[PDB]
Amino acid sequence: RKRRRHPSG
Amino acid sequence: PLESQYQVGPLLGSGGSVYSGIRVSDNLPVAIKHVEKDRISDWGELPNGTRVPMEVVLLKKVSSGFSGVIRLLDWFERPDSFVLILERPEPVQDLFDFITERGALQEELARSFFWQVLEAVRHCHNCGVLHRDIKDENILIDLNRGELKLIDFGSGALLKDTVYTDFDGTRVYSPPEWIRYHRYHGRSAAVWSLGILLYDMVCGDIPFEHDEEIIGGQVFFRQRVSSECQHLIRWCLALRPSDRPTFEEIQNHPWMQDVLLPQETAEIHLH
Numbered sequence A: 001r002k003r004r005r006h007p008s009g
Numbered sequence B: 001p002l003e004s005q006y007q008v009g010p011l012l013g014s015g016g017s018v019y020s021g022i023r024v025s026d027n028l029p030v031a032i033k034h035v036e037k038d039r040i041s042d043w044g045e046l047p048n049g050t051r052v053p054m055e056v057v058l059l060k061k062v063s064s065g066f067s068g069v070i071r072l073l074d075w076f077e078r079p080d081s082f083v084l085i086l087e088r089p090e091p092v093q094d095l096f097d098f099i100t101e102r103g104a105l106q107e108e109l110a111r112s113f114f115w116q117v118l119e120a121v122r123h124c125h126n127c128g129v130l131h132r133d134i135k136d137e138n139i140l141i142d143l144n145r146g147e148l149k150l151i152d153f154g155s156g157a158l159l160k161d162t163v164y165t166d167f168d169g170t171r172v173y174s175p176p177e178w179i180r181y182h183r184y185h186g187r188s189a190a191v192w193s194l195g196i197l198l199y200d201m202v203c204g205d206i207p208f209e210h211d212e213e214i215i216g217g218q219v220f221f222r223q224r225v226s227s228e229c230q231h232l233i234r235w236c237l238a239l240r241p242s243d244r245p246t247f248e249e250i251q252n253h254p255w256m257q258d259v260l261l262p263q264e265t266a267e268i269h270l271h
């Protein structure tokens, strides 16, 4: 399954 | 002159903008971070009384000495931006990429990393600084030394004991009291994000993706995780903030005993 980064804000 | 003290090189990343560089004075590897004044939300003042971005204020408060925190080595003001000169370990990989490439970490390695993150956050709090964006993306691994370094204080704040009503960190690491009420206290919110981080290390990805999962209070383990480690994770992710462990209780937890030293960690797991 998709592991992704997450932006801050 | 900033442009005469440092040889500027390749863009390391952005999302301000961070360039690899070398201090001309002694060939020291540095990272050079540019932040546009127009895009700065929180401002502070230093001892000089100069108005600087809060990120600069927080970096100076934690950069005294050696730590698992990135050291601010210098800064410059420009017409429309500030420029920060930071330490650059080499060779380095950030913890997000490391977990992507390796998958779920062995508990022995996650113990060593988590412990080092706890010591770095304790250092921040001792210096009066709340990071507010603890996550694997904001953690560098010095692959030769086995040492972790906390980076990116651009969403942090001075540590206080009263309620916070603003937040600009990463929502999937933010606690349920923020999701539901737009309020949180500093240390217990930090502990929540550390539970998310620990799960991320031993399972290979963060547990929650949507608001309803964050407030839902159910932690499903998708990998084999020891009962002691599951207990610590579930304790850090207690829905009520006052039910979460303190940093002392985390570090006294039975899953945390007999940590590897950084050098042992590099030799067994990183070399």
Ligand SMILES: Cc1ccc(/C=C/C(=O)O)cc1
Pocket: B012, B018, B031, B033, B070, B086, B087, B088, B089, B092, B140, B151, B152, B153
């Ligand atoms: C490789 C590297 C990447 C990033 C930093 C610092 C960034 C920050 O404090 O936001 C330092 C080194």
